[PDB]
Design a protein around this nucleic acid. Sequence first.
RNA 1: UUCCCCACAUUGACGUUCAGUC
RNA 2: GACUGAACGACCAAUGUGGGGAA
Lengths: 396, 397
Amino acid sequence: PSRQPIPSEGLQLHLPQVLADAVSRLVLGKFGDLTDNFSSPHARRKVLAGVVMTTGTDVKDAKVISVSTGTKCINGEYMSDRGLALNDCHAEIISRRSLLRFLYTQLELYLNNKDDQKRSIFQKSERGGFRLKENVQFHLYISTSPCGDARIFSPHEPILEEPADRHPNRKARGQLRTKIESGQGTIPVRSNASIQTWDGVLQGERLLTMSCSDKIARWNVVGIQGSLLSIFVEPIYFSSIILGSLYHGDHLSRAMYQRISNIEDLPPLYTLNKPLLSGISNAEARQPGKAPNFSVNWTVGDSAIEVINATTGKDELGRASRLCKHALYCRWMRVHGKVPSHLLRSKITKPNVYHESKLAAKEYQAAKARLFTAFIKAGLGAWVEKPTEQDQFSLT
Amino acid sequence: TPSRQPIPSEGLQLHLPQVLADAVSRLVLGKFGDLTDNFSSPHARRKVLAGVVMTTGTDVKDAKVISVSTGTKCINGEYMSDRGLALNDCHAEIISRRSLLRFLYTQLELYLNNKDDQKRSIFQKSERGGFRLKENVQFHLYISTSPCGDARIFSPHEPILEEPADRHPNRKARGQLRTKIESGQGTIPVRSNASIQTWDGVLQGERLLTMSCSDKIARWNVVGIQGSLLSIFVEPIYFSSIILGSLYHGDHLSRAMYQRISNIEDLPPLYTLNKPLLSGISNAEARQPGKAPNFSVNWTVGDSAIEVINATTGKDELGRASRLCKHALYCRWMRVHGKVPSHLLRSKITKPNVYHESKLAAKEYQAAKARLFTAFIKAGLGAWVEKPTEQDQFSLT
RNA sequence: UUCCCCACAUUGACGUUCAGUC
RNA sequence: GACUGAACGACCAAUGUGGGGAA
Ligand SMILES: O=P(O)(O)O[C@H]1[C@H](OP(=O)(O)O)[C@@H](OP(=O)(O)O)[C@H](OP(=O)(O)O)[C@@H](OP(=O)(O)O)[C@H]1OP(=O)(O)O
Ligand SMILES: O=P(O)(O)O[C@H]1[C@H](OP(=O)(O)O)[C@@H](OP(=O)(O)O)[C@H](OP(=O)(O)O)[C@@H](OP(=O)(O)O)[C@H]1OP(=O)(O)O
Ligand SMILES: [Zn+2]
Ligand SMILES: [Zn+2]
C-alpha cells in the first residue's frame, strides 16, 4: 500500500502513472539532450530534478520547463550581501528557481506586444494582475525523495505492498528540519531555536538551510512563484510531485501537506495545495561515485546549461548565477517598469532594496505567516530564516 | 589585495606593524598553549581566542603577555545577579579587557606597596594628579577573529565597494550599533524604535541586549580601556594596536573601531578618538564551522591556572563568582582606595558605598561616555543600550 | 502505541594517500 | 595553484533497528 500513487483533486484529468512516467522520461531525456547523451563533463549527478508544463490532456503536449542537478548548500564564508550567490543547490530548489526565470520570460512575452499575448501562458485577471490560462499545469520531478520529513525515515526503497510507517506517531514525524553546514542528516529546528546571525555564521556557527521537504510544503501553501512575482501574478501551484526513487506515500503526503492540515485564515487565492503524489514505474538506480561539488541548471529557451559551484554559489570563474537573488531582482525590476500600474496585484510602492520590495507582496507575506503558525501550533517547530542582512541590497 | 593590508596607527609607532602583529599573535597563542597543557586540555576548546600584550620599548622582545581568554557567548537574562556576581559578557575580547583591569589594579598595589617597587611598577605619579603610565608602555589587543558587530558585517569573498566619496546616490548607513542576541554568538542591529530594558522584565525572559564587541571596542577607543572606576586613580589608557587572526578588512575594521564616530566633539582633557594600529596576521586562521564551547576561559599574568566560566550563567560550573565580575573588581578597587592617600585621587569620591555611585564619581569618564553616545546618535547609528540601573546597586562585605 | 536505556546501523564537511585535467 | 576522480581514516546530530525496561 505504501508504494502507491496518492491522487490529487475531486475530478481526474490525467492517468496518475502515465503522467508520472511521462514527466520522468521527459526530464531525464532533456537532461540527456543537454549533456550529449550523459557523456558531458557535467553529466555526473547524484540527484536530478525538473519541472514539466502541461497545456492539455494530449500527453504529447508536454514541455520540459527546467532541469537541474545538485546536492549541496553554500559554505558560510561565501554568503553574499549583494545577493550574488546561490544559497541552496539541492536540485529541486534549483529547478523551482529556473521555473521563476521561465515565468518572468512569459510575463515579458505578454507585455511585449499584442500578437505575443496569445502565446504567453498568462492572461489578465478580473481581480487585477495576471493568472495562468485555464489549462496550464506544472509538475515537479525529483529523482529521489526531498530531504527532511519525506526522506529521513526510510532512506531505502520499500518492499512493495508493504504497510506504512510502523511508528507513525513519534514526535519526530512531521518535524521541520534543516540541512546543517558541515554535518550530515537534516535536523529538527526545535533544537536550534535561536535566529541566525551574519557575524555568527561568518565566525563559524553552522549555517542552517530549511530541508527540501519543508520548502516544498511551503510551496504547497504560498505558491511556487514567490513574493516578487506574486506582485504581478496570482498564486501558482504544482499539480504533481513525482519521485524517481525512494517513494513512500505515507511519508511524502505527511511531509507535503498533511502535517499542516490545521492551517487557517489563508488570504484570498491561497490554499493548502494537495498535488498528485507518485513514484514511477521503473525507479532510478543509485548514481555511483562521489557527489559532485557542482550544480547544473537549465531553463527552456536557454542555449547552454549553467554550472555552479554549490560550495560558493557562483560559477567556476566566480561570476553570479542567472538564478541568484540579484538576477531575479533585475528581471523583476524590468517587468515592473513595463507593467501599467493599474495591473499590479499589489500597488504598494516601496524603496528599491530587495527585502522592502518583497514586503510589498502583503498577501504573500500573510500566507507565509499562516504557514509558520501552522507548523508551530502543530508542534513541528519554528521556521529558520537567513540572517536579515542577506536581503538588504539594491541594484547598485 | 588592498583589503588585506595593515592600517598604521595615529599613536606612537614604536614597532613595525607586521613584526608587531606576528609577535603578539604568536605570544598569545603560545601562552594559551602553556596554560592548557599544550592544547590537549578540555578547556583548550574554543571558537575565539583573545589576549593582551604589553610592550615597554622599541625592542619587540620586551613584550609580556598580560592576559588570555576565550569565549563567544553572553549571559542568559534570566541568570543575572543583583549583587553583581555574574559576568554579563564572555566574548573573548571583553574578558581580556577585564583581565587587564586586574593587572592594572595589581600594578597600583605594586607602586603603593613601598618605595622600591615604584621603579618596577608600570605607573608613575602624574603632574596633573593621580597616576599615569610610564613614558613607553603600550598595550596591544589580539582577537583570533574580527570582533562581532559592525566589524564582521561583510562578505569576505566579495570585493569592498562600500562608500563612494560623493554622497550615496542611494543612502547611509554602514556602522549601525548592534546587540548580541541572547543564546547567540551573533548580533543584530539596534531598533530605531528603541524600548529600554527593565530588570524584572528581562529576568522574566524578555530579550537581554548586550552591545556588540565592535561597539564596545569603539567605546574603548574613546573612553579608554580602564573604565570609570580606575579612571579615578589613573589617566585614560588606550590600546595602541588591534591585531586580528581572521576576517581582517582594513576598510570595515577602520570604520568600526573609530571612523564611524569621527564626528565626536568636546571630549574632556586627556581623552581622544584613539586610532590604533589595525592589522591582520601572516598566516590567518581558517573558519572552523562547528559547535561553540559554552564556556569562557580567562587568565591574568601572575595567576597559576586559568579560570573557567559558564557563559550562560556568568559564573563557574559550581556556581562561584568569577575573579572578573563587578563585585570582584569592586573588591580590588576598594583595597586600592584604602592604600591611596586622598590628595592623590584624580576625582573625589569620599564614602564609597554602592557600586554605581562610585562609577558616577568618575565625572570626566562619564562626560566622555556622554559625548560617545551623542556621537553615535548624530551619526545616525542608533542609541547605545545600557543595563537597567538595578544591576549596579550593590555594596561590599 | 509512546517514551527510556543500551548496543548496532544509516545519512554534509575534514584529513591522509594515489592518479588525472587546465 | 585550481579543478577532478579512486582508496583510506576521523568527524558531524539526527534517524532506523534490535535486546532490555516504563507509562
Ligand atoms: O528556497 P530558495 O530558492 O533557496 O530561496 C528562498 C527564497 O529567497 P529568494 O527567492 O529571494 O532567493 C525565499 O523568498 P520568497 O520568494 O519566498 O519571499 C526566502 O524567503 P524570505 O523572503 O521569507 O526570506 C528564503 O529564505 P529564508 O531562508 O529566509 O526562508 C530562500 O531560501 P534560502 O534562504 O534557504 O535560499
Ligand atoms: O566588560 P563589559 O561587559 O563591557 O562591562 C561594562 C562595564 O561595566 P563593569 O566594569 O561594571 O563590568 C561598563 O562600566 P564602565 O567601567 O565603563 O563604567 C558598563 O557601563 P556603565 O557602568 O558606564 O553603564 C557596561 O554596562 P552597560 O550595559 O550599562 O553599558 C558594561 O557592559 P555589559 O553591561 O555589557 O557588561
Ligand atoms: Zn534536499
Ligand atoms: Zn563579540
